Amino acid sequence: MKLNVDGLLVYFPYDYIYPEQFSYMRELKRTLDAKGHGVLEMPSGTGKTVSLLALIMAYQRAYPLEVTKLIYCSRTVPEIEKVIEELRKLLNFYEKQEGEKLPFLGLAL
Amino acid sequence: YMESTVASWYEQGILENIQRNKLLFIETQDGAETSVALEKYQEACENGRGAILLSVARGKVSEGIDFVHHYGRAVIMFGVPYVYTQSRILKARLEYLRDQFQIRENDFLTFDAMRHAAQCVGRAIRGKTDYGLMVFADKRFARGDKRGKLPRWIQEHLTDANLNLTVDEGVQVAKYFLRQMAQPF
Amino acid sequence: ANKELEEKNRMLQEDPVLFQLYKDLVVSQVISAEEFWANRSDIIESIFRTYPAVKMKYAENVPHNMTEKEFWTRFFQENSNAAIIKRFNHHSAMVLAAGLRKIALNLKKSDRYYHGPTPITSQDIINSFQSIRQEMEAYTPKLTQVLSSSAASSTITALSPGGALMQGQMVPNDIQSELKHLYVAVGELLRHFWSCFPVNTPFLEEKVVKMKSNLERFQVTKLCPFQEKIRRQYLSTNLVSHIEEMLQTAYNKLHTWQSRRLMKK
Amino acid sequence: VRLGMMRHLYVVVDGSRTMEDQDLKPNRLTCTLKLLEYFVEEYFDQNPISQIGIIVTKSKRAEKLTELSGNPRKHITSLKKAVDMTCHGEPSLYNSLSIAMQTLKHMPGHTSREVLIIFSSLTTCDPSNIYDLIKTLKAAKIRVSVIGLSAEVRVCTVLARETGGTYHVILDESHYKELLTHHVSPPPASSSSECSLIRMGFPQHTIASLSDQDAKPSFSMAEPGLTLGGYFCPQCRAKYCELPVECKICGLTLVSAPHLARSYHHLFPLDAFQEIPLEEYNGERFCYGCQGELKDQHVYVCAVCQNVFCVDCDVFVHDSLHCCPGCIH
Amino acid sequence: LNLLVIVVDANPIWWGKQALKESQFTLSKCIDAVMVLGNSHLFMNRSNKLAVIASHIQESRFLYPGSKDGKYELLTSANEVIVEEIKDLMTKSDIKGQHTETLLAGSLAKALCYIHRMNKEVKDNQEMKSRILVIKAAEDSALQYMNFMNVIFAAQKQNILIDACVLDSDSGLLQQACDITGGLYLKVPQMPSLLQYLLWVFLPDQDQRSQLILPPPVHVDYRAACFCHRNLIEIGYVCSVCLSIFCNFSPICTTCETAFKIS
Numbered sequence A: 001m002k003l004n005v006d007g008l009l010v011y012f013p014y015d016y017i018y019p020e021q022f023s024y025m026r027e028l029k030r031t032l033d034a035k036g037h038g039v040l041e042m043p044s045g046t047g048k049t050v051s052l053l054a055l056i057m058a059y060q061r062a063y064p065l066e067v068t069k070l071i072y073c074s075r076t077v078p079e080i081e082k083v084i085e086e087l088r089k090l091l092n093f094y095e096k097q098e099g100e101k102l103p104f105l106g107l108a109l
Numbered sequence B: 001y002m003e004s005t006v007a008s009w010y011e012q013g014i015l016e017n018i019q020r021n022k023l024l025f026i027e028t029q030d031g032a033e034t035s036v037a038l039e040k041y042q043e044a045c046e047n048g049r050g051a052i053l054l055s056v057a058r059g060k061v062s063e064g065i066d067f068v069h070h071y072g073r074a075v076i077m078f079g080v081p082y083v084y085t086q087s088r089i090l091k092a093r094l095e096y097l098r099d100q101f102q103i104r105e106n107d108f109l110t111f112d113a114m115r116h117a118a119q120c121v122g123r124a125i126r127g128k129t130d131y132g133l134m135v136f137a138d139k140r141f142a143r144g145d146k147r148g149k150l151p152r153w154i155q156e157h158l159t160d161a162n163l164n165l166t167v168d169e170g171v172q173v174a175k176y177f178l179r180q181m182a183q184p185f
Numbered sequence C: 001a002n003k004e005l006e007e008k009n010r011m012l013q014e015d016p017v018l019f020q021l022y023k024d025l026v027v028s029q030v031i032s033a034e035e036f037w038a039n040r041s042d043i044i045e046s047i048f049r050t051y052p053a054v055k056m057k058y059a060e061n062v063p064h065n066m067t068e069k070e071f072w073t074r075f076f077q078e079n080s081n082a083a084i085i086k087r088f089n090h091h092s093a094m095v096l097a098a099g100l101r102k103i104a105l106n107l108k109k110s111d112r113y114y115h116g117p118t119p120i121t122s123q124d125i126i127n128s129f130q131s132i133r134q135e136m137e138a139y140t141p142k143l144t145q146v147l148s149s150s151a152a153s154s155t156i157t158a159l160s161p162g163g164a165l166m167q168g169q170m171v172p173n174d175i176q177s178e179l180k181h182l183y184v185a186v187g188e189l190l191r192h193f194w195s196c197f198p199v200n201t202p203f204l205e206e207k208v209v210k211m212k213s214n215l216e217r218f219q220v221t222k223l224c225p226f227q228e229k230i231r232r233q234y235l236s237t238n239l240v241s242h243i244e245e246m247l248q249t250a251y252n253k254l255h256t257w258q259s260r261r262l263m264k265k
Numbered sequence D: 001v002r003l004g005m006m007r008h009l010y011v012v013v014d015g016s017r018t019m020e021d022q023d024l025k026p027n028r029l030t031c032t033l034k035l036l037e038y039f040v041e042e043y044f045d046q047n048p049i050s051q052i053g054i055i056v057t058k059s060k061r062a063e064k065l066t067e068l069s070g071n072p073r074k075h076i077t078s079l080k081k082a083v084d085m086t087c088h089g090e091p092s093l094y095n096s097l098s099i100a101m102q103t104l105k106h107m108p109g110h111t112s113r114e115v116l117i118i119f120s121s122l123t124t125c126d127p128s129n130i131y132d133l134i135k136t137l138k139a140a141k142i143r144v145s146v147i148g149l150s151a152e153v154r155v156c157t158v159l160a161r162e163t164g165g166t167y168h169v170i171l172d173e174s175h176y177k178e179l180l181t182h183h184v185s186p187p188p189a190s191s192s193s194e195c196s197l198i199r200m201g202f203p204q205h206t207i208a209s210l211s212d213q214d215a216k217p218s219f220s221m222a223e224p225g226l227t228l229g230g231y232f233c234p235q236c237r238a239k240y241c242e243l244p245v246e247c248k249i250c251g252l253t254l255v256s257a258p259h260l261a262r263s264y265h266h267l268f269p270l271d272a273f274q275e276i277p278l279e280e281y282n283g284e285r286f287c288y289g290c291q292g293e294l295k296d297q298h299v300y301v302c303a304v305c306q307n308v309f310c311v312d313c314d315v316f317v318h319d320s321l322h323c324c325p326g327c328i329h
Numbered sequence E: 001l002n003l004l005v006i007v008v009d010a011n012p013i014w015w016g017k018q019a020l021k022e023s024q025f026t027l028s029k030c031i032d033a034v035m036v037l038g039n040s041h042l043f044m045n046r047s048n049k050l051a052v053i054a055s056h057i058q059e060s061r062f063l064y065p066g067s068k069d070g071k072y073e074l075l076t077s078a079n080e081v082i083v084e085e086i087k088d089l090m091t092k093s094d095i096k097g098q099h100t101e102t103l104l105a106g107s108l109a110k111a112l113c114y115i116h117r118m119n120k121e122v123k124d125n126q127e128m129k130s131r132i133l134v135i136k137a138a139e140d141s142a143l144q145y146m147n148f149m150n151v152i153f154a155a156q157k158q159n160i161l162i163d164a165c166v167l168d169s170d171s172g173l174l175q176q177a178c179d180i181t182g183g184l185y186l187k188v189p190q191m192p193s194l195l196q197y198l199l200w201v202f203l204p205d206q207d208q209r210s211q212l213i214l215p216p217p218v219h220v221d222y223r224a225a226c227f228c229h230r231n232l233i234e235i236g237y238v239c240s241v242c243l244s245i246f247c248n249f250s251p252i253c254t255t256c257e258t259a260f261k262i263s
């Protein structure tokens, strides 16, 4: 599922995304393009993590110099474990799409 | 407040009827008892007995725990969550915010209540489109300010028709909504 | 343990038919009775399963110079505030613990269904077709042609009870119960006799019991005809021959299968 | 898709006091029993060879209201008697499923053993854990398809999906009718299911030979008076009042040809007819099925006969007749 | 009220054989008798209604959806419509030597769905007791057993009485059919006097049939046979898929191809 976002093309593992996901991605891309701190709210407990991670990875690929790395913080370790699971699934999907390993590292402290 | 309400229900026959209808579990300050009670609550939810977990909004259990499909199906909020108006730490924290950044004391207090309520009531919609209803047993939430400060996604679903339902009307509409959600897509 | 004796005492009078037939098999001394069986409050209970402490207290305080009413009285009897919450948590946990005590089908012949088990020149069709085409150039002859009085009278006479197409006793009452009882006895013993008869059972230990049952057939059918004789010599009316067919057919199956077994050997 | 024509089905009804709640227009238990009477009669009318059994569970104990039988009237009478049942206590899935398992364990392998638990009270107080019983159920290949009421019970969800059955919850009374009518039909046979030949016997109705000469008087076999004529058995030679019935001696099923023929339509399902609203060059005003003018913009057609059927004709054909009238030709 | 449906088996082959034989009975007289029966049925009451179906080897067609002789207008319309339509159908017909057996199952299916349509349209205030007065006139076809059994069971479920009036031949399938739904079975041996049989045995409706003496039902031989040589069998070995009555125990029934496991 490759989404032709206004800023660029962004990969996505799951089949379909709700319109609220489109709005989230476009607003997030606007904030990153402005390179200014901002705040936004999304209802779903899950799904926001995958959309955010996919958009950040695509933005990193497009403008690697713009963003050095992502620092994604969660309330509790049991919760951040689910985030690392989501990131692992996304990386597996992207690796299958590309056909080879890429210099991408992701870890939890 | 939870203990006082539980004691009153125990003195009356309501609590025994609730126990008959469904299992009842209560939260305590001690983490070990909290964990054991929640562990048994999960098994009760898996089984057909069901469970009614009484907890505190500020309780660490409320923030740590996440409710998913067939877990915390109906989230009940008994009273607007407000911290005691005697803890002097909040007095500094609040009057300083009034002096600097110009936030009204009542504004910040209601914000602290609404944010906490949204935190403790927003778990049922975790993911995978699992149905569930959030009932707030307090006429205060019906006030415009509370509704306005409520998160947009919940508020827009909320309507004036069901804004101030009586207990019986709320029960009937909850039954009907559960009927609608039971059937597949 | 005399479990068989206890069961016999339990069913001696609780169920009339079972003991009646079991006794009947011995009344004429047909066979040993061994083969017969060889071949074939709420609140206190809830507390008992709820509170293990109450169970231990009951065991230690079993009624001794006391009264169950007093024992009942003993039941109901911030420090107290937290005790209530703890008590509900523990009690619900105890209840929960007590409740958790340890091929796509394909076919090659479908017309067989179209013609199921129900069982079963060229110029003739042309001739019949043309003749029937020319038959009905005239219509509405109902005035006289459809029916005639003579034929109608013949039809009514036929419909009469003595006519064609229309061909046209509960005297004994007490004998009915005796016949029912005999039929029940026959059914009871035929059940075991036919239990493994249809199955070949080519095993020594399996065939022993069919041999014993086959001998039991002779032994029961020895006594059946005596009661038949008693009933027969009353009026010589309303013959009861259906019972004879069951016995004779069982004998025929027994002898035919014996011959087949000898042939197989 | 392989289908199990012969199935021994147990409709497990719960006498919980949750059944007391009048969620439906009449009392819940009364409505369930009244509709289950129709379900029983229709099940026998759509699967004569099959047989049914009712287990009523209340006060943590399960009692067999009626053993396995081939007579719908006896079960209907049991339902009518149970309508007045007190309806107090708590059900036990372990007890009910254990009773059903005990009765169904000795059933023949070829027949499909099935259980339909009409669950009303979400609670399940059982002496022993039911997850262990789930293993025995899977080993015994007893299909269990729960139908919950006003609750999506997790233990019953896992029961249904693990054992191969289906789980459902009642949206309303109309949907309850649909659920039970759907469960009436035989379920498809899965990989675990196995088929084997079953001995069958076909009796012939007999009467007095000639003017009550060499008659065969007999009363019945399960206050029956003397019968001049009736059905018989190839092996029992014992008079039977009604068919189909299992032999009381042989253990062989006695059943006539029409009863078997009643189930051929299951093997031969009717392909759905495409619904075209527009006339589509259909100049025949009269509907071929009913010879009536099409008063609605709807038409149905086969892929073989290519005939025209109205809404009522198509609905009736696919519902009851189970065969296309013109396409028979 | 009562909705009567006359399923006449007007087989051209057999009726034209009668015509060639020049026998006293003719299809014209049979149609006249059926017409008189329908007229009498409607004569019984205003609410009563009737319909007619004619059977042919190719298909089956409905014969029924001033007072020139001083006649009742409705019955006059019935007479005219049935006469014209039956003459048209008999006059126009293609020839197919391969198919000559009379078709009855399709006609009965049409009757059943027609009765269902009328029951839907009629007001719920009045209850309708439909009936099908089948009048066979030729031997049945073996290949039609399955579909005929389907329609018979549908009629049983829908509560319609199949009153068979076979003549010149005793169709075991048709007698079995009417026995299931409880409809009467009369075999008239006097074809010329057929109408008297209708005005007595068939004409009275189910309401009054019980409180009336009618010829006793004929014994029905519910025979079974194996799919090999077509002969009566008392013990059948059916499987769990085919549900087919067979000859003797076999490793695998041909119509199934299942992997039966011995034991």
Ligand SMILES: [Zn+2]
Pocket (backbone or CB within 6 Å): D233, D234, D235, D236, D237, D247, D248, D249, D250, D251, D252
């Ligand atoms: Zn038998």
Ligand SMILES: [Zn+2]
Pocket (backbone or CB within 6 Å): D287, D288, D289, D290, D291, D292, D309, D310, D311, D312, D313, D314
């Ligand atoms: Zn139509």
Ligand SMILES: [Zn+2]
Pocket (backbone or CB within 6 Å): D302, D303, D304, D305, D306, D307, D324, D325, D326, D327, D328
């Ligand atoms: Zn068709």
Ligand SMILES: [Zn+2]
Pocket (backbone or CB within 6 Å): E226, E227, E228, E229, E246, E247, E248
């Ligand atoms: Zn054969």
Ligand SMILES: [Zn+2]
Pocket (backbone or CB within 6 Å): E239, E240, E241, E242, E243, E253, E255, E256, E257, E258
């Ligand atoms: Zn087969």
